[PDB]
């Protein structure tokens, strides 16, 4: 209920929080502000909307504009040279119960963490970048853990199915590419499954509702380097963080307001 | 660093060693030289090239020239009638930590043992060569193996993953063919998936980094025979084999200089 | 070695014996005559042609002849008025060691043994025919056995992979048609893949050789019934049962003579 | 661990420093860019690629920018007013061993270093040098000479050639040309023989087994005075001189390692 806190974006440390006011959006979706104007600010959105018959969806993007004076006017308009979206349609169940999204829910911190895969690779901008990664998805803690690990490589299009069927375990997909004279897409669909109501296999199962399908792209400007990079990834983490209302949200099987 | 040190190819026993001077080749590639001229000679190459966003790859060539007189000419000019050209694109991770490449590294010296698969296949070159084996990939040691059996004979062209998934497992491609009047390939794949920073899945594995794409294209010669074969293997496992330049800078996620 | 053997094809009890006498056949293959004419006897063939080039065949056929008065002339002319041909293409390994192809042969009497899946079902020729079974491919006895269901059911042709992954698992292949106004065919290719060299999973693996193709085609007559059904299946288990000629040849990686 | 990372390269006093990160490879292309700022960035490439059966040849591009103050529109636009272009396609065939690539980086970096009569044309008045006769280049030990005489520019572009043989001749060429209305472009190539002995039809003929191909072509506008173009060859030249990052992969395995 009411998750609209104002969380930190970006846990820089305290020195220039990317605090953002929470609390905003139309026509189906959420918004969280910063301290400044109109063209410098963070976007942070995250909307809800039933994808299909069984499986409702979870339109999550986040910008990260580089704060710098603008080069097309010489005066003091702050506005961002060049812009990092962050587009992730996170499908979900629903009549599941609540545990099940805790299970999704740290399936999108742990995809994000301090000193692990994406995070400290889209981070350099250079020599790891884009993606393909692994991370144990759900992060339990000692006991039923989902380990991953990777097989085919064709066209350059990966696809990683967990410890179990190519139609029964964590999926995840993504590409990039220059797709015109300046930017380029991480393509980094993140298909996470359902696995929950139950001890470590013992039958209490009845779990419901099937897959999401958080398709990603995140373009990325020819502009960035190794600094602003890191600032764009704390901005994918600081978005699905435990205890924020992005991921609270994606928790309780719920919105905002 | 600096893993450029002269190591023999070919483990013969001492006499006739294909010991190669290190240190070589331009833009972005290696070499190992042999005490001849250039013409007779054994070439072997390895390049690090960062294949895409969050892959780099390794490519690997090894000539095994057959030392033989010139029927070109009645003179004394040293040069190969026919060449064995080893190709061999290991992609990589490389924010992982060190012990993931020696499970790669594992994976390449395995692949071509004393009395194994691939190794006594290629070289009877007959009732046995061209592709399509199996071995442990990762030689750990008694603890932690990788189990890979087989399935799939589409078209004749085999594709194996172990143990886990049909997108989470070390899988390996190939194919043979008489691409013209004289020569024929073997395109043997061998896509190295990454699993380390684990002791046998206890949850501290954070991995980083997805897959590799060893593609390999191994044309030999119709003019071989049983023993210029065994030679052929030699310099394929001379290359990767534990202590020498080629696999050592694969082992450290780096290149030789 | 000469596992040329006078073997009965058909157990069925003593009497009418369809004892066949070995040492025959043309140009690469083998036979196994009955104690009849060049018209109503049944032929026993097994050919081994290296298929690829890591990977060598096995054709097996297996006539299955009605014995009955011919109905083109009225005389005492022996011959059959229609045959259950059986083909099978079955690949396999050569330098693994010899008790990978045991795997193998307990993979073909396994596949046809008394009171199990096909032997019992094409042999009521009717509320059971044609393909698609379950069986412990390797009878190991007690412990190493493998298990293999089945999901797929596309276009009414499947394939079913074991306890492993859809690239490194015992698979199989089928499917049924009226191929023209009289005869229909039993496409049942059974890809056995090898699993050798090794107690339990204990290191001690190093197998090698990829696969093999036992792709079959068994045309049946519809002038067929049950009981000349239960014969057209025990020509079949009477083919590759322990200690005769066709299964022991590829029990020791070895045709006969 | 990680190469192709963060490097030094074109210094000069201590006030600027220029170092490289990375960047991009996309479709086989590296990429290296400096600092902050992209339009003030020195990118520069390097791609491995097998041209046929028997060469090797490759793609390094360098674009050295001009930390310049481009104002229009009342903003202060930090961008380069031109860029460079040493572009270096270099050949290596399979049959010239790992001892012929050694001596040929130090022939195609070690042509231009600072000053020599080919590249002292681009730092200075007499892109000749000398009214354009015999000169020094190449060298190792006491033992071959390179002296590099004059031969010829029909329609305007320049010509070395070496000593006795012309097959075993070191060519080198330079031509003036302004592309447009505000720039004036360059085209200096080099090819690199081998002194070595193609015996066919029984005659020892001396003939170089391949050669270099160190191309760069250079823009200058006529906007930027007489003050940039010194600090450009010492980035061009002085971009790959006997080990650098970018020259030391022209030299050994290290790509940038």
Redesign the interface.
Known sequence: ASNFTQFVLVDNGGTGDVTVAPSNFANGVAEWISSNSRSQAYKVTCSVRQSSAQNRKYTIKVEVPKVAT??????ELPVAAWRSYLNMELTIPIFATNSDCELIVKAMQGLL?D????P??IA?????????????LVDN??TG?V???????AN?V?????????SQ?Y?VTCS???SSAQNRKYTIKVEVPKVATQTVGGVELPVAAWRSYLNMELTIP??A???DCELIVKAMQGLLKDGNPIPSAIAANSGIY
Chains 1, 2, 3, 4 share one sequence.
């Open positions: 603008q080069t097309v006017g010489g005066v963490k000193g692990n895969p994406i400290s690779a350099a901008n250079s020599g790891i970048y884009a993606n393909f990664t692994q991370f144990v803690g000692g853990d380990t991953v690990a990777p097989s085919n490589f350059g990966a696809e990683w199915i967990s410890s179990n069927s190519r375990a999926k990039v590419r220059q020819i502009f380097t190794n600094s």
